[PDB]
Amino acid sequence: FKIPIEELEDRVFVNCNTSITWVEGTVGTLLSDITRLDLGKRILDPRGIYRCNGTDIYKDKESTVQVHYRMCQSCVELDPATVAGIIVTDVIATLLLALGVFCFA
Amino acid sequence: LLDPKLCYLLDGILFIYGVILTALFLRVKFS
Amino acid sequence: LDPKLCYLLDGILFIYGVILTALFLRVKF
Amino acid sequence: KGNHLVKVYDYQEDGSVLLTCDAEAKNITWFKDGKMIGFLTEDKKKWNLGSNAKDPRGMYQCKGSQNKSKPLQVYYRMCQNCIELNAATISGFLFAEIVSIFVLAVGVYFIAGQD
Amino acid sequence: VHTEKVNMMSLTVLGLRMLFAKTVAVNFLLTAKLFF
Amino acid sequence: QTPYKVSISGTTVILTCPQYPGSEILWQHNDKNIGGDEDDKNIGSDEDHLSLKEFSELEQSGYYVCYPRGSKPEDANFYLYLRARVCENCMEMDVMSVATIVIVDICITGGLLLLVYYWSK
Amino acid sequence: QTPYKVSISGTTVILTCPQYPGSEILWQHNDKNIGGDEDDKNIGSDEDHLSLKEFSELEQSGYYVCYPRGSKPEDANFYLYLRARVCENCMEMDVMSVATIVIVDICITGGLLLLVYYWSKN
Amino acid sequence: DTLLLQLTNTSAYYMYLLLLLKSVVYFAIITCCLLRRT
Numbered sequence: 396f397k398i399p400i401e402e403l404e405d406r407v408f409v410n411c412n413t414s415i416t417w418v419e420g421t422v423g424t425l426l427s428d429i430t431r432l433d434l435g436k437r438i439l440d441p442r443g444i445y446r447c448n449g450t451d452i453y454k455d456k457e458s459t460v461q462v463h464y465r466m467c468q469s470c471v472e473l474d475p476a477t478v479a480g481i482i483v484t485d486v487i488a489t490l491l492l493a494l495g496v497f498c499f500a
Numbered sequence: 501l502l503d504p505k506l507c508y509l510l511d512g513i514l515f516i517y518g519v520i521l522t523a524l525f526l527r528v529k530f531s
Numbered sequence: 532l533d534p535k536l537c538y539l540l541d542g543i544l545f546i547y548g549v550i551l552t553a554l555f556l557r558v559k560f
Numbered sequence: 561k562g563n564h565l566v567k568v569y570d571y572q573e574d575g576s577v578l579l580t581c582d583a584e585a586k587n588i589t590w591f592k593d594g595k596m597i598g599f600l601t602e603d604k605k606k607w608n609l610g611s612n613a614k615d616p617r618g619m620y621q622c623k624g625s626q627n628k629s630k631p632l633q634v635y636y637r638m639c640q641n642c643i644e645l646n647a648a649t650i651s652g653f654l655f656a657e658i659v660s661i662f663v664l665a666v667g668v669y670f671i672a673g674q675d
Numbered sequence: 676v677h678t679e680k681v682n683m684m685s686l687t688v689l690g691l692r693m694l695f696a697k698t699v700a701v702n703f704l705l706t707a708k709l710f711f
Numbered sequence: 712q713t714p715y716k717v718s719i720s721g722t723t724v725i726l727t728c729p730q731y732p733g734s735e736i737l738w739q740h741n742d743k744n745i746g747g748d749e750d751d752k753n754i755g756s757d758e759d760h761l762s763l764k765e766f767s768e769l770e771q772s773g774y775y776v777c778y779p780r781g782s783k784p785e786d787a788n789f790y791l792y793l794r795a796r797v798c799e800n801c802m803e804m805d806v807m808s809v810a811t812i813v814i815v816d817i818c819i820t821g822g823l824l825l826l827v828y829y830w831s832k
Numbered sequence: 833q834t835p836y837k838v839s840i841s842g843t844t845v846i847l848t849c850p851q852y853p854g855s856e857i858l859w860q861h862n863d864k865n866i867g868g869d870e871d872d873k874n875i876g877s878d879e880d881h882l883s884l885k886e887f888s889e890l891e892q893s894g895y896y897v898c899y900p901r902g903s904k905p906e907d908a909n910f911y912l913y914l915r916a917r918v919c920e921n922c923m924e925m926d927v928m929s930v931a932t933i934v935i936v937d938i939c940i941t942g943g944l945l946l947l948v949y950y951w952s953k954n
Numbered sequence: 955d956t957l958l959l960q961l962t963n964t965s966a967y968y969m970y971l972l973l974l975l976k977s978v979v980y981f982a983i984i985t986c987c988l989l990r991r992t
């Protein structure tokens with residue numbers, strides 16, 4: 396009875412008994428047909444929430460899939476040594492600028 | 501991807517301070 | 532295309548700023 | 561089998577390389593170039609190396625209940641620090657170097673003239 | 676191809692450009708001091 | 712109704728069940744019991760959370776579910792569906808963050824220069 | 833004991849077999865006999881090399897064995913995994929390559945600036 | 955086209971590192987004269 400999140404080449408889908416609802420999260424590209432809703436790109440990080448009711452075989456049931464996707468195309472991998480070097484040399488350069496301004500004044 | 505936007509983000513300062521310097525140079529000279 | 536043109540902009544702006552500051556400092560003198 | 565127990569699984573959606581030992585026994589001693597590196601971790605059969613961007617190498621044996629497995633050499637050459645030596649890049653590099661040298665030379669010339 | 680590192684390299688390049696601008700300012704400032 | 716809270720600080724992924732805070736809770740990952748048995752340190756049930764270490768995308772991505780201790784686990788109504796590309800010491804920032812850093816750095820540089828200028832005289 | 837020495841230049845990948853000095857030598861890539869025929873692009877194994885032209889990361893990569901004719905492929909003492917990425921005329925930067933350009937640049941800049949200064953003194 | 959961006963980024967990184975080193979050399983050159991002047 397759990398909602399079968401189905402993965403295409405670049406799309407996600409949601410299936411349940413009643414019309415695929417929307418309570419919170421991303422809306423996506425709505426399709427008028429029941430049990431078939433695509434959010435579009437997986438890169439947009441789908442994070443929608445789709446409550447639902449029970450089916451005929453499973454009456455008075457509830458399948459709340461809080462579908463969460465984190466495939467970040469904008470992530471970075473910080474390098475601590477590089478960050479420390481950049482910070483230290485920026486501090487040194489700012490100190491030297493202050494030295495020059497003081498020497499002038 | 502961050503796209504080629506941070507390069508122009510840095511170039512903004514080099515563009516604006518150059519024309520500020522032009523403004524000061526024209527204010528003090530000629531006119 | 533974009534990065535090379537932006538670096539060209541960087542270089543030309545740096546050179547022009549240097550030249551104009553050098554010219555301004557004579558004028559105020 | 562042919563005593564080739566070590567294998568590599570790749571093409572995963574994440575970036576990493578892993579070693580799978582197909583020995584039907586527990587406490588299978590891993591190696592790296594004839595040396596003790598790390599004892600087997602029980603309940604898991606996939607020793608970990610790291611990311612493919614780091615360019616892992618070396619031969620990895622796998623000593624099970626029977627004799628040692630034949631080590632599996634690994635080679636990776638993913639370009640992380642590869643630059644492009646086309647026609648444009650060299651011209652840009654030389655032009656920037658020449659302009660910077662000329663500007664510094666003019667500055668130090670004026671410094672000499674003053675002092 | 677994984678873009679998780681290319682963004683880090685772009686950030687490093689931006690930081691290097693900022694430091695270069697600061698060093699140019701320092702050298703101009705001290706030469707001007709030598710001239711004044 | 713209240714959504715789950717997934718926090719990813721590095722490779723460590725912590726999943727918190729916000730629907731049964733008062734009662735003791737145990738976790739199940741795809742209809743099978745996970746955590747709470749203290750079998751390893753990679754998985755571990757905290758006071759009200761499930762702590763997952765060395766996270767992977769093929770395994771450990773599925774219908775996580777939380778059920779109260781001493782209750783029926785099968786009649787579960789809330790199934791988190793998680794698919795995460797988790798990596799060590801990685802963050803998320805767009806152009807706005809680096810723009811903030813650049814502008815603020817200009818700010819401290821200018822402020823410090825003015826401060827030294829006014830203190831020198 | 834004697835590992836595969838693989839040297840990659842440009843967009844072409846060539847790897848060696850310093851394990852059989854002189855003998856007829858065959859190759860296999862993903863259990864498919866690679867080489868021979870008449871070089872449908874240069875893939876044919878050389879005397880002790882298999883040099884690939886227009887190397888494709890996704891299509892041409894995997895387990896490479898180096899065994900002679902009349903021998904079962906399982907008799908090799910070690911397999912090899914080749915997962916390489918190539919591009920048009922790119923080069924890497926090792927520590928000894930970065931430190932070469934750094935030292936050369938510092939020395940040439942210092943020398944030229946000192947020459948200009950000591951010339952402009954008078 | 956991500957590979958092209960990678961190549962451009964590393965090229966710019968090395969070029970600006972070289973420019974920073976040149977600036978450091980010039981800073982030493984001017985600092986010696988400034989210290990000997992005052």
Ligand SMILES: CC(C)CCC[C@@H](C)[C@H]1CC[C@H]2[C@@H]3CC=C4C[C@@H](O)CC[C@]4(C)[C@H]3CC[C@]12C
Nearest residue numbers: 514516517518519520521524548549551552559
């Ligand atoms: C692009 C570069 C040149 C920008 C540098 C900073 C510009 C915006 C500002 C910062 C401090 C300014 C200087 C501060 C003080 C003086 C002294 C005054 O009697 C004439 C103008 C002059 C000389 C200003 C010129 C413009 C100046 C150099």
Ligand SMILES: CC(C)CCC[C@@H](C)[C@H]1CC[C@H]2[C@@H]3CC=C4C[C@@H](O)CC[C@]4(C)[C@H]3CC[C@]12C
Nearest residue numbers: 553556557560663664667670702703706707710
């Ligand atoms: C970018 C670095 C490497 C070099 C910068 C050189 C700059 C700082 C130098 C080059 C020539 C210099 C000028 C030479 C002569 C004069 C005339 C004098 O009456 C006022 C100062 C003034 C106007 C100098 C200001 C500083 C100056 C513009």
